[PDB]
């Protein structure tokens, strides 16, 4: 149950929660950030009000997906209960330095990207072309007389 600012709060069962496994691992961890707990706030999923929806598109944040939604990464330690409480608090505190007024920006810079591979498999193999050609034939023209 978070406590949206203007007038909106949004439920308690109603939140969106992942679960964040972080690049495929190749037998063992090449990684640590296979562990993470995943939650988002969408415009669409809810009824958000007027004044709420237009801080969203102009408080330009990095929590800012795109479409005005905002998604949280949270991953520190283990035991979820942490990792909620953390999320939403902070989320919560957001929520409200940008439902205020004015001068109240940056604070946010969640440095997480990175993700890089290969990947090119191509065997087919069709063997037919076959050749031949053994010939001798040698031209020779040489010259041959006395000079005077």
């Given at each position: 149950?978070?406590?949206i600012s203007r007038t909106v709060s949004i439920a308690d069962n109603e939140l969106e929660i992942t679960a964040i496994r972080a690049?495929?691992?190749?037998?063992?961890?090449?990684?640590?950030?296979?562990?993470?707990?995943?939650?988002?706030?969408?415009?669409?999923?809810?009824?958000?009000?007027?004044?709420?929806?237009?801080?969203?598109?102009?408080?330009?944040?990095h929590l800012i997906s795109d479409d005005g939604v905002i998604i949280i990464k949270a991953q520190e330690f283990r035991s979820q209960?942490?990792?909620?409480?953390?999320?939403?608090?902070?989320?919560?505190?957001?929520?409200?330095?940008?439902?205020?007024?004015?001068?109240?920006?940056?604070?946010?810079?969640?440095?997480?990207?990175?993700?890089?591979?290969?990947?090119?498999?191509?065997?087919?193999?069709?063997?037919?072309?076959?050749?031949?050609?053994?010939?001798?034939?040698?031209?020779?023209?040489?010259?041959?007389?006395?000079?005077?």
């Amino acid at each position: 149950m978070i406590a949206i600012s203007r007038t909106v709060s949004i439920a308690d069962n109603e939140l969106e929660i992942t679960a964040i496994r972080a690049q495929g691992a190749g037998g063992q961890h090449v990684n640590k950030t296979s562990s993470a707990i995943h939650l988002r706030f969408d415009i669409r999923a809810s009824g958000l009000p007027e004044y709420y929806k237009q801080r969203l598109l102009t408080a330009s944040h990095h929590l800012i997906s795109d479409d005005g939604v905002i998604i949280i990464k949270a991953q520190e330690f283990r035991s979820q209960e942490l990792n909620r409480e953390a999320a939403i608090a902070r989320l919560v505190a957001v929520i409200k330095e940008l439902t205020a007024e004015q001068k109240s920006r940056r604070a946010t810079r969640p440095t997480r990207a990175s993700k890089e591979r290969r990947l090119s498999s191509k065997a087919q193999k069709s063997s037919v072309k076959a050749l031949r050609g053994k010939v001798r034939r040698p031209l020779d023209l040489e010259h041959h007389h006395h000079h005077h």
